[model samples]
Target chain A: LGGLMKQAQQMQEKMQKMQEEIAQLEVTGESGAGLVKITINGAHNCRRIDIDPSLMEDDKEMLEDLIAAAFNDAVRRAEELQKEKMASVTAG
Target chain B: LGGLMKQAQQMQEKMQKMQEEIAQLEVTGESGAGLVKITINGAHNCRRIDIDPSLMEDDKEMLEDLIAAAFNDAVRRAEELQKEKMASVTAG
Candidate 1:
């Protein structure tokens, strides 16, 4: 029981450390069929956005929708990558 | 110090239990402009795949690519959702 308790204590400390590290992680989200891209931190804070000039035409509404979808797509990808990375770290 | 230690131990148990629950969670991925959908478990295991019948034509290669993309998209969404959920649980 004492050994298990010690292990749990160590795991808790490790988890806290990992959480701090994850906060510094960055992920990119793209939308508009990849015409627009947004980058965010693991804290889900948006850091930057890039828009393709070609998408600034008469199809503004469609372009907007595509950009939204792309950003979401990127966010989703970022999350998966984060999880895979975290899982490996934790397992190790 | 003893109280803090006890709290840490409790947190460790909570985290382990939460991880088990997360493993059973399900997430969906879609591609082909949302025409292809795939469901995956928290374990990153594919549970199901859905494809639009209209896409089952001579463009088999495109369809295949879309399916792959969609599955990847869904998995990403799931991971993000899981992280958000876990963060909330741990913080609480």
Candidate 2:
């Protein structure tokens, strides 16, 4: 009971800490040789997007696809980070 | 030890189930009266985006803002769902 109780207490602190850790983490992804770059937080919210001005003159469809690719790349990284962090929390 | 073990066992099952539930959920957001719409899974991966063709000739900056708005909206919903689901799992 004592170990379990201590574990439960630490879990709550670690859980809160984990949430803030994720929120503060920033991840970036790029595509088209930097034609498109996106930065998103652990919350999966876009913080910034940089699109080559040249892309603005290019095909809109192509530009959109590049943006999507960049976003997905960032999302993949964020998901991986989340899994790792959650695993650490659980194992603790 | 028995109670704690059972709790731990159920927690693992519930956690896995919660992840799958979130992954299977779809949330949608819209902006400019549906001029821009985005659908994302609970994982915060963009599943789809629908833009009005009429906006093709409009100011690109405005269009981009609307898209961001829609994406943000969808993200908010997904986050809310995740928190709710997590709360339920923890309570169990």
Residues B12-87 of candidate 1: C-alpha lDDT, one tens digit per residue: 9998889879768888877656687767666554466566666544344454456446645766787787898888
DockQ (C-alpha based) per candidate is: 0.04, 0.29
When candidate 1 is compared with the true two-chain complex, its DockQ is 0.04
What TM-score does chain B alone reach in each candidate, compared with the true chain B? 0.78, 0.77
Q: DockQ score for model 2, please?
A: 0.29
Instruction: State the lDDT at A38 in candidate 2.
Output: 80
- Report lDDT (CA) for all predictions: 0.65, 0.77
lDDT of 1 at B82: 82
Candidate 2 second chain TM: 0.77
Docking class of 2: acceptable
Among these predictions, the greatest lDDT belongs to 2
Candidate 2 lDDT, tens digit per residue, A13-67?
9888978886678888777888877888787777777767676665667766777
